[PDB]
Design a protein around this ligand. Sequence first.
Ligand SMILES: NC(=O)c1ccc[n+]([C@@H]2O[C@H](COP(=O)([O-])OP(=O)(O)OC[C@H]3O[C@@H](n4cnc5c(N)ncnc54)[C@H](OP(=O)(O)O)[C@@H]3O)[C@@H](O)[C@H]2O)c1
Ligand SMILES: CC1=Nc2c(-c3ccc(Cl)cc3)nc3ccc(F)cc3c2[C@@H](O)N1CC(=O)O
Length: 316
Amino acid sequence: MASRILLNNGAKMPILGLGTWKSPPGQVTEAVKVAIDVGYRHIDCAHVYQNENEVGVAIQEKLREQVVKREELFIVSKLWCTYHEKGLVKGACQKTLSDLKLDYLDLYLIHWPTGFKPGKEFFPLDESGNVVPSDTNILDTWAAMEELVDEGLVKAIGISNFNHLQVEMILNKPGLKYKPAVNQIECHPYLTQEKLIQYCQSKGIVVTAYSPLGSPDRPWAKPEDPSLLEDPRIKAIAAKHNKTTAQVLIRFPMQRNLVVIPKSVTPERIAENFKVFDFELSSQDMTTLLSYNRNWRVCALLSCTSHKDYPFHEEF
Ligand SMILES: NC(=O)c1ccc[n+]([C@@H]2O[C@H](COP(=O)([O-])OP(=O)(O)OC[C@H]3O[C@@H](n4cnc5c(N)ncnc54)[C@H](OP(=O)(O)O)[C@@H]3O)[C@@H](O)[C@H]2O)c1
Ligand SMILES: CC1=Nc2c(-c3ccc(Cl)cc3)nc3ccc(F)cc3c2[C@@H](O)N1CC(=O)O
């Protein structure tokens, strides 16, 4: 298993990265330091995660320690929904760069296809709890992303949580300057994404799997919800390989030619999660894990189901 996948800009992206959603600012600096120490070279960030300064501290420290140089790192961030207006995109990118203490990003994603009213609140609500949309559209936001590449702020651009029709809208745009390099989507044994993966891979778009462990720390979880890490069937596959369930869950997308970004702030788990290059899931293991699909999403963006660009009405 080669550790990187080639993107459309000629750069190579590490297939295993560290996720940072819900990594509290008071804990994420150490997590990123440990991750770099044990070999992670790809960090998945976002402005909305409210912790980019603390990620940036860790990166700066490890650069000053001579542990890594910048060119060996693959830093991803994402344009939040309240910044989809063309005139806000550059400032949002530059805020992320300033917080991360970087002079470029390796990859910058449109975080969701839905634009929200601009302003200080990340999820602006009306008096009845509906998300307030903005008068923005995918193609104009994409054109603003393209400018970031032309100005050297970012090396590649991509999308996240786009359905195939939304991807196609960019691909077919008259005057397209850059194709999206990546679509980052939820993917795990309960939401296997067979059709959207087939679509993206056939169009030369690399897929990154988010919430590979089923996001047990997500803030809307219900106790009756399915739990991947506790699934006794996956535990049995893991035992057979002398690996943990988490390690099986990370290796699974790697063998589908996906990038995967498990999150932890716990040092032992950060190291555990990287130790996935020393075993192989069998054909039968892959087939069995795929067979657990239930089309079950942990990140369904439920406050946005009436937004014109809500991505999850389409089958894929
Ligand atoms: N583009 C998007 O819209 C989007 C949406 C969701 C996620 N993401 C990205 O994908 C990343 C990963 O997804 P996620 O954060 O939702 O969840 P996840 O990676 O599926 O699961 C993270 C949870 O699993 C725990 N954990 C980690 N390693 C473990 C292990 N070896 N054994 C047991 N438990 C373990 C973590 O606990 P501790 O941290 O306490 O150790 C945390 O509670 C995010 O952090 C973010 O970077 C992107
Ligand atoms: C899937 C997702 N949902 C939200 C939400 C959210 C919670 C519930 C609902 Cl119905 C919709 C969105 N809240 C967040 C609060 C703080 C923060 F830092 C991030 C919050 C996020 C967000 O970061 N997250 C992850 C993502 O979009 O990558």
